[PDB]
Design a protein around this motif. Structure first.
Motif, PDB file in Angstrom:
ATOM      1  N   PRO C 229       0.807  -1.230   0.000  1.00 51.18           N
ATOM      2  CA  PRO C 229       0.000   0.000   0.000  1.00 51.18           C
ATOM      3  C   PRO C 229       0.831   1.267   0.000  1.00 51.18           C
ATOM      4  N   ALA C 230       1.932   1.294   0.747  1.00 49.17           N
ATOM      5  CA  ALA C 230       2.768   2.487   0.770  1.00 49.17           C
ATOM      6  C   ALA C 230       3.336   2.773  -0.611  1.00 49.17           C
ATOM      7  N   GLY C 231       3.849   1.741  -1.281  1.00 47.80           N
ATOM      8  CA  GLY C 231       4.388   1.939  -2.616  1.00 47.80           C
ATOM      9  C   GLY C 231       3.325   2.355  -3.610  1.00 47.80           C
ATOM     10  N   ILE C 232       2.141   1.748  -3.519  1.00 47.62           N
ATOM     11  CA  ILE C 232       1.058   2.085  -4.438  1.00 47.62           C
ATOM     12  C   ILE C 232       0.664   3.543  -4.271  1.00 47.62           C
ATOM     13  N   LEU C 233       0.461   3.977  -3.028  1.00 46.87           N
ATOM     14  CA  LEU C 233       0.055   5.357  -2.799  1.00 46.87           C
ATOM     15  C   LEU C 233       1.165   6.330  -3.169  1.00 46.87           C
ATOM     16  N   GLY C 234       2.420   5.983  -2.890  1.00 44.03           N
ATOM     17  CA  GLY C 234       3.510   6.863  -3.272  1.00 44.03           C
ATOM     18  C   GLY C 234       3.603   7.033  -4.775  1.00 44.03           C
TER      19      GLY C 234
ATOM     20  N   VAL E 223       1.644   2.946   9.695  1.00 42.38           N
ATOM     21  CA  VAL E 223       2.862   2.480   9.042  1.00 42.38           C
ATOM     22  C   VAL E 223       2.845   2.873   7.573  1.00 42.38           C
ATOM     23  N   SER E 224       1.696   2.715   6.916  1.00 41.08           N
ATOM     24  CA  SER E 224       1.589   3.125   5.522  1.00 41.08           C
ATOM     25  C   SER E 224       1.782   4.626   5.377  1.00 41.08           C
ATOM     26  N   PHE E 225       1.177   5.412   6.267  1.00 39.28           N
ATOM     27  CA  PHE E 225       1.306   6.859   6.132  1.00 39.28           C
ATOM     28  C   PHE E 225       2.718   7.334   6.439  1.00 39.28           C
ATOM     29  N   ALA E 230       8.721   8.046   1.625  1.00 38.51           N
ATOM     30  CA  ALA E 230       9.779   7.350   0.905  1.00 38.51           C
ATOM     31  C   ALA E 230       9.313   6.947  -0.484  1.00 38.51           C
ATOM     32  N   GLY E 231       8.108   6.388  -0.581  1.00 36.51           N
ATOM     33  CA  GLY E 231       7.590   6.001  -1.881  1.00 36.51           C
ATOM     34  C   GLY E 231       7.364   7.191  -2.790  1.00 36.51           C
ATOM     35  N   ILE E 232       6.844   8.285  -2.235  1.00 38.90           N
ATOM     36  CA  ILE E 232       6.593   9.480  -3.035  1.00 38.90           C
ATOM     37  C   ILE E 232       7.898  10.016  -3.601  1.00 38.90           C
ATOM     38  N   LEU E 233       8.915  10.150  -2.752  1.00 40.60           N
ATOM     39  CA  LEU E 233      10.187  10.684  -3.224  1.00 40.60           C
ATOM     40  C   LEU E 233      10.863   9.728  -4.196  1.00 40.60           C
ATOM     41  N   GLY E 234      10.774   8.421  -3.953  1.00 39.25           N
ATOM     42  CA  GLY E 234      11.365   7.477  -4.884  1.00 39.25           C
ATOM     43  C   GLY E 234      10.715   7.543  -6.251  1.00 39.25           C
ATOM     44  N   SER E 235       9.383   7.567  -6.280  1.00 41.52           N
ATOM     45  CA  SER E 235       8.683   7.685  -7.550  1.00 41.52           C
ATOM     46  C   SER E 235       9.005   9.006  -8.226  1.00 41.52           C
ATOM     47  N   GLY E 236       9.093  10.088  -7.452  1.00 41.88           N
ATOM     48  CA  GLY E 236       9.456  11.364  -8.038  1.00 41.88           C
ATOM     49  C   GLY E 236      10.834  11.337  -8.665  1.00 41.88           C
ATOM     50  N   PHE E 237      11.806  10.753  -7.966  1.00 42.08           N
ATOM     51  CA  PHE E 237      13.154  10.661  -8.513  1.00 42.08           C
ATOM     52  C   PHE E 237      13.171   9.828  -9.785  1.00 42.08           C
TER      53      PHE E 237
ATOM     54  N   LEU F 220      12.750  10.650  11.983  1.00 39.11           N
ATOM     55  CA  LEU F 220      11.677  11.037  11.077  1.00 39.11           C
ATOM     56  C   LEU F 220      12.189  11.362   9.682  1.00 39.11           C
ATOM     57  N   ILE F 221      13.454  11.748   9.555  1.00 37.73           N
ATOM     58  CA  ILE F 221      14.056  12.059   8.268  1.00 37.73           C
ATOM     59  C   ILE F 221      14.933  10.918   7.767  1.00 37.73           C
ATOM     60  N   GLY F 222      15.733  10.338   8.660  1.00 35.08           N
ATOM     61  CA  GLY F 222      16.672   9.315   8.247  1.00 35.08           C
ATOM     62  C   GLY F 222      15.993   8.063   7.738  1.00 35.08           C
ATOM     63  N   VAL F 223      14.861   7.686   8.334  1.00 37.63           N
ATOM     64  CA  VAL F 223      14.175   6.491   7.859  1.00 37.63           C
ATOM     65  C   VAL F 223      13.725   6.689   6.420  1.00 37.63           C
ATOM     66  N   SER F 224      13.189   7.868   6.109  1.00 36.42           N
ATOM     67  CA  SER F 224      12.788   8.151   4.737  1.00 36.42           C
ATOM     68  C   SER F 224      13.989   8.141   3.806  1.00 36.42           C
ATOM     69  N   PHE F 225      15.099   8.747   4.226  1.00 41.10           N
ATOM     70  CA  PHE F 225      16.256   8.795   3.340  1.00 41.10           C
ATOM     71  C   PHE F 225      16.886   7.423   3.153  1.00 41.10           C
ATOM     72  N   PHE F 226      16.718   6.523   4.118  1.00 41.99           N
ATOM     73  CA  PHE F 226      17.245   5.172   3.981  1.00 41.99           C
ATOM     74  C   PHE F 226      16.310   4.278   3.185  1.00 41.99           C
ATOM     75  N   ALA F 227      15.011   4.569   3.203  1.00 35.86           N
ATOM     76  CA  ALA F 227      14.067   3.845   2.366  1.00 35.86           C
ATOM     77  C   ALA F 227      14.016   4.379   0.945  1.00 35.86           C
ATOM     78  N   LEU F 228      14.565   5.566   0.701  1.00 40.68           N
ATOM     79  CA  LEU F 228      14.551   6.136  -0.642  1.00 40.68           C
ATOM     80  C   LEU F 228      15.138   5.215  -1.699  1.00 40.68           C
ATOM     81  N   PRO F 229      16.298   4.587  -1.499  1.00 33.21           N
ATOM     82  CA  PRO F 229      16.851   3.748  -2.573  1.00 33.21           C
ATOM     83  C   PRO F 229      15.915   2.645  -3.023  1.00 33.21           C
ATOM     84  N   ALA F 230      15.208   2.005  -2.093  1.00 29.64           N
ATOM     85  CA  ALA F 230      14.285   0.948  -2.480  1.00 29.64           C
ATOM     86  C   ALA F 230      13.186   1.494  -3.380  1.00 29.64           C
ATOM     87  N   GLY F 231      12.604   2.632  -3.003  1.00 32.41           N
ATOM     88  CA  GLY F 231      11.561   3.220  -3.825  1.00 32.41           C
ATOM     89  C   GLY F 231      12.074   3.666  -5.179  1.00 32.41           C
ATOM     90  N   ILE F 232      13.269   4.255  -5.209  1.00 29.72           N
ATOM     91  CA  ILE F 232      13.844   4.710  -6.469  1.00 29.72           C
ATOM     92  C   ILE F 232      14.057   3.534  -7.406  1.00 29.72           C
TER      93      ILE F 232
END
Ligand code: P0T
Ligand code: P0T
Ligand code: P0T
Ligand code: P0T
Lengths: 330, 143, 330, 143, 330, 330, 143, 143
Positions: C229-234, E223-225, E230-237, F220-232
């Motif tokens: 769900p997180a990936g889908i919404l992102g 957890v999803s929110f 991360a998903g939003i920024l990854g998709s954006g990149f 709150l920031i580092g978790v997103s920046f560490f999950a970024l590669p997976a989403g990208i």
């Protein structure tokens, strides 16, 4: 008054069977009902709450079996809309549907048990939840998206599995002696799986500093490779949603359908045999155009369309060119 | 039979103006124009592709015999017409209103005349109830 | 000097009400202020820090209520720009806005409490934070994106829930005896939820090796299905951002608006009745073109545009063809 | 009333050159060309679609009576013109400057002449303050 | 031999300054070197390994300061390629670059300390790592992508924060009594943050079954929110990468640049004054076309191009139409 | 009967070597077999299960070596389809393939060990799993996607690493005294890595409230920046899948290939020398058109195509214009 | 000065054939065609948009005086020409080879003649070293 | 050799109608039209781009000598023709059936005549087994 009864019955069929709009709310309510059952059943497993849990669950089971029976009857009565489900034989065939037979089975099972079957109760709750799909749509959509990205998912899985075994083995070597967590290689594999997945229970974790160094270097990669499938599938689902959204606009299935119906009728409706030939060839053409309007149904067709017109342009000017050539001699 | 084969050969010769046993785009286009209906280049090529089961772009009498030897039973057109009608049926239950049919069908695709709509109604609105069901109509279409 | 006062007032209205550029910085500052309150309030819950926390929070509450009162007054004064909010009645209607009434209510509540209400203090901090949205834009955007991917989110939820119950039940069977963690099925469900979510507290984890094998096999899938769900919404949010970014370029709402205004005025402005007819028909045409410029507002229109010209091209050459036909006879 | 109905029928006949009680694209196009304004095929088709409330592509006197019976009050054109003007209003507060109006409005859409801009100013710039407000203008438009 | 020296110097400048291809490998090596320092420095913080760690780190610091000095000198010698960095003044300006002054500062600091400054060593290692960016490219790219999705990120943050505080408060209410983990509201907030982030230390977790029920229901959403950003920024990149990849193909900056240079020169190069007018107007046109080739630089221009040609075709046939009109009279 | 034997052999080659459809199922079965070995080998590391694990693993190793030998022989017999692998020399070259030599090596090693080598057994299981790729396709695809997003991945890594070191250092300062978890800076770095990755073992976590505040703000920031590669990477893989899916439709490699073959043959097949010139120039043209059909192979070509026709239209009308000019004088 | 203003007015009148003090697209197009160079409709509209600093689509003498009053110093064309040349410079260091310049510059954009390339070389290849640097060239361009 | 160089110069002069030592698009187009086959503008420009190894858009005798000096060995056309044939080969094993070859090859690309297909079969179907292998054919192509 067959008109009003038919109207009410078709509304009930729409709300019960595949709904479109506000009808979902009703189903949501039903979902909550069955959902409640689940929770109550879980509470019925606790010795502390067994008494009150079962006390409430008896009333709730009466309620849910009554609701499901009423819904089943209203459904087999509103099934009269569908031509296939008309009359005794049609309605019997309707009841032959796998979800309908499952519904009646769960109903009679609940009636029997109400009048130890806790496992049966849980399974029947699961089944009445599963019936909501009623089509496999969830499974079909997931399978389609997974198949589309099969190669990417498999490469992610393969690389993640190599990373898992390698990191677990190296940390096991670094920790086999000075850490009771990594007694055997199975313990190290369990650790590696529980960390690269980012679950991280904390039951096992490296303590020797070379072990921690290896764990850090390998987790920095393994966590990403284990999170890759979620991102891949999420992006695939979103891209598919966008594709379907943009595809559902042109709706180019109307005119081909009309042409197909006209051609089929006409084909059903020396020189006479040649005319019937021309007609059956045109019927094959109608089949072909309908099929080519079914499968592609994509934006690429637009490009194809342009190409056609492109060639058309060329051809047309050729005629025009020919015309002016005559003007040279006149 | 002998009569059917002779008539089929006569029809093919009517199509095969040249008489060489190979029908091309030009002859089919010209003969069908003589019939009255004007085709398009894409339309002729589509007929050629659908009828050319040999691999040379032209047809011979055996192919025409195998074509007309087809029967309404084996056209396998059931599901196709069903999905077409579901696209037509806004409700989706499987019934088409007479007024909707009159407005739509005669004003799209291969347009039809008043006699045509009359005969559709005759052989489809058997009960005269307006909401014409098509499953029976297509089942008798196959037969 | 009404000119300069109006200019300053419109600048203040822009900075306070929906801002566009650097004004956000000011709001950010205000946010920080209220944010500080939150933190301080939390610190006020600790017995150790209660004294100093409340001591600082008293001064900070004085500061924040003063700032909010000044901002509220400057706002109801700068509201004079909007025509609806002009004069006594207009400004009273402005104050009737739900966020304005909420603002004055929180102001008078803070004034009263300052001169036990800790729960009230926390709720009012929450409310003055919520007011920042002021339109539901966050909720509306989230709802739109969720609805767009409703089917994908629901299939992910359904498959993840089936995986959760199945894995938890199987691990419960494998561990009901040799692990005090999985006393009942509720404990196993809690474990499964806390692991498939990847939270992994570590309070419960399988220990029997068949249990660990089942947990591994089922987590490898459940974690992905719970992260879906997180990936889908992102991906949905990012795709929507890209769509909006590319849509905001052509800006084809200018000419249709001008035509609509002209037509509306003219329609307001035997043969005379026919002329007025023509005019009202053209007014309906203006309404239609404006609406068709509102809803689609997408790149697909470009394709449609081409199609139009496509057909147009046909038509024009036909005329050209007709022309040369005459030249045949001349 | 009787006079209004008679005048509406006279106007419809002016549109209905044929006299068969069914106005088509050709008649409307020709009569409105004779009026002076040259239409387009898409324009005529859009008028037909907006005015055809029956389902046959042609119109009769009752439809024209129902149309013209429409009044400024119930057109529900308020929100549409509001959003249009907000698109016009760069500031977005709800006021349009006289110079901006003069430059833009007369040089886009259905172009207007000097008398037209003069009458817009007369019936819109009531206060003569330049920054013409349109909410009052549209409220009196509805009335 | 100035030719060969210039060639070698330009190669060295390419490898040192912004590189394109295999030169990255060299930088990677340098990275590893400085990376090693980091690790060694960390090991130097352990009392157990302090001796050996510092022993190796002394030699490694000698090596790294020697390498950095040699690289700095080779850089200020290969800077002669750039016209701005030519001669005494040009090279002094080159050394004025912030990263160059930082480099010399870290060099002299390392030389001084080598001949307690552990904190200085750690900071200087950080700085020589940071210098690798040398442009802010990472920061600029991240800021661009974040700004593009500012609204989506902010709505995700707002909804996640509301979910966090709500779930924390509700679980605190459910657990304030029967769980020493949730002594105060700060403890509950810490729990909620550590779980919705999916970190899940396990130090605090609900134990009362109503608390666990609330935690489950609210985690399933939180957890999803919290994973949404991360998903939003990854998709954006990824979408930005795709956009840049497709944009870098047409490369329509050549002809506008040539036209601009021609026009600029010509404008530099009664009737004479009118000619110079025409020329300066054409220079303004060149500026405009260059700018319009700079900003959009997107696939939408193609649509615009078509539109242009679209209108063009219209106009063209009009002339053709006019022509045939004459043929009517002839 | 060489015809039927050739047919069966080509079917076997298709199922063994690169398969397309249902053949994958067979490979899946084989995978399971080798997969089983893995698990059994892991179970063979447990002292408790060593007896039964090894007992089953002996029979399973007999089975797997028999299957692999039979598959190897059937493969070197079905290799006769490929022209390169025909006859003694062709089949010997086939066996020279790295995966074939690896297969025979693992076979003879398993035979020898069967008639301590547990590490050898694990390595050979790994190798026979790796052979399934047989081309590096997984590695090549991952490398391509990573290279495409190299800048985004590197910026994510750099920002995440800065966040990690900064947060770990600040929490270390906040906790160096009142928490035995953060004894040294290495402990704090381990904590920061294990939390920003969201693994969160729970072995180390902040306890001082300033430490917890810093940890919250920085997580709150580092978790997103560490999950970024997976989403990208997930978005990149999905976008690449979509691109490949839309590219595989037009299939414009047929006509250029036919033209290339014709031109190559003709070029192989005073005035004669000029004709041979024309032919070799046309051969170069065929090479160029084939290459230009290889590399781009993208939707952008369509735009280019339009542009061509665009210019073409211009040119065509010019000719038409010229024609009417003559009509002016006639 | 007086002479400069008089010459500018003479040039404007040369452009302003009508003599009404408002230059339009037709006059500029015709006069520039008489000069020898044929423009395009988009080109004329671009000149109008770039030169129309009033808001009516036509120009008057004061606008031309303000334009021509512009000097090489304040055009702020530095960075633009710099980026253009970097696009030209394949290496990116900031030097252009003589052969590359001769091949590219004269065979793209507004094509130039042999005298033109000779004068570019004269005023750019001051050192005659082949690798023409442009930063000095553009600095003297501004002056 | 001397004879080869003389013949190459004669061929170039045949191409170089003007006699100035610089072949342009017009001369090649006209001469190769006189040969019989009609080119396109893009085709001529592609030939110019592929043959222009100098940088002025025209060619001289040395370039033609270097081109024709090329031999079948060093063209490095192996992998290209291989991939082309794999695209042709539906099975992908590396063998092409005679019937598929006849149907496809003569009905696509630069269309060939019956003598052409006969000579392809003669020099490719050495074994006369139908499933013509092309690796040997291309190896002898290179030689
Ligand atoms: C149905 C989903 C979501 C995919 C596809 C089918 C497979 C077997 C698992 C999923 C999946 C993981 O859940 C995890 C990984 C990471 C590697 C794990 C190491 C064994 C890959 C991986 O494809
Ligand atoms: C508003 C969001 C983000 C979606 C949509 C609405 C729903 C009910 C939850 C979210 C969500 C999960 O947070 C987690 C899952 C995984 C399955 C959990 C098993 C109960 C699915 C799932 O749709
Ligand atoms: C720079 C990134 C990556 C974004 C944007 C800037 C902000 C303040 C944080 C990031 C971010 C989170 O890291 C986590 C959430 C979830 C809500 C947390 C509740 C406080 C939202 C959220 O935008
Ligand atoms: C091959 C993958 C998946 C990428 C690319 C190569 C690199 C070195 C690691 C992966 C990756 C992380 O796994 C984690 C981060 C976050 C920063 C970690 C701080 C050291 C960045 C980061 O690029």
């Amino acid at each position: 008054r067959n008109a009003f009864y038919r109207k009410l019955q078709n509304f009930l069929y729409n709300v019960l069977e595949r709904p479109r709009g506000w009808a979902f709310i009703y189903h949501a309510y039903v979902f909550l009902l069955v959902a409640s059952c689940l929770v109550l059943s879980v509470f019925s497993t606790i010795k502390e709450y067994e008494k009150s849990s079962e006390g409430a669950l008896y009333i709730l089971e009466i309620v849910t079996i009554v609701v499901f029976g009423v819904e089943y009857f209203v459904r087999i009565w509103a099934a009269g809309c569908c031509c296939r489900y008309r009359g005794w034989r049609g309605r019997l065939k309707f009841a032959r549907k796998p979800f309908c037979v499952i519904d009646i089975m769960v109903l009679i099972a609940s009636i029997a048990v109400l009048a130890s079957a806790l496992r049966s109760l849980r399974f029947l709750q699961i089944l009445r939840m599963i019936r909501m799909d009623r089509r496999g749509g969830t499974w079909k959509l997931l399978g389609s998206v997974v198949y589309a990205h099969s190669k990417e998912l498999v490469t992610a899985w393969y690389i993640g599995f190599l990373c898992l075994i390698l990191a677990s083995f190296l940390v096991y070597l670094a920790e086999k002696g000075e850490n009771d967590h990594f007694d055997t290689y199975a313990d190290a594999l369990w650790w590696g799986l529980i960390t690269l997945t980012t679950i991280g229970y904390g039951d096992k974790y490296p303590q020797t500093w070379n072990g921690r160094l290896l764990a850090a270097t390998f987790t920095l990669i393994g966590v990403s490779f284990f999170a890759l499938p979620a991102g891949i599938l999420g992006s695939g689902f979103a891209l598919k949603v966008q594709e379907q959204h943009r595809q559902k606009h042109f709706e180019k299935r109307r005119n081909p359908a009309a042409g197909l119906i006209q051609s089929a009728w006409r084909f059903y409706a020396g020189l006479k045999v040649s005319i019937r030939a021309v007609c059956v060839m045109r019927f094959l053409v109608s089949k072909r155009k309908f099929k080519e309007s079914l499968r592609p149904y994509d934006v690429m067709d637009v490009i194809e369309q342009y190409s056609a017109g492109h060639l058309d342009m060329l051809s047309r000017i050729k005629s025009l060119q020919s015309r002016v050539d005559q003007i040279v001699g006149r | 039979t002998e009569e059917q084969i002779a008539e089929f050969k006569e029809a093919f010769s009517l199509f095969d103006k040249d008489g060489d046993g190979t029908i091309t785009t030009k002859e089919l286009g010209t003969v069908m124009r003589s019939l009255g209906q004007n085709p398009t280049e894409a339309e002729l090529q589509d007929m050629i592709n659908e009828v050319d089961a040999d691999g040379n772009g032209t047809i011979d009498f055996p192919e025409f015999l195998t074509m007309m030897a087809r029967k309404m039973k084996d056209t396998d057109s059931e599901e196709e017409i069903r999905e077409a009608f579901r696209v037509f049926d806004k409700d989706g239950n499987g019934y088409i209103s007479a007024a909707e049919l009159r407005h739509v069908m005669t004003n799209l695709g291969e347009k039809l005349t008043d006699e045509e709509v009359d005969e559709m109604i005759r052989e489809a609105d058997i009960d005269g109830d307006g909401q014409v069901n098509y499953e029976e109509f297509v089942q008798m279409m196959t037969a």
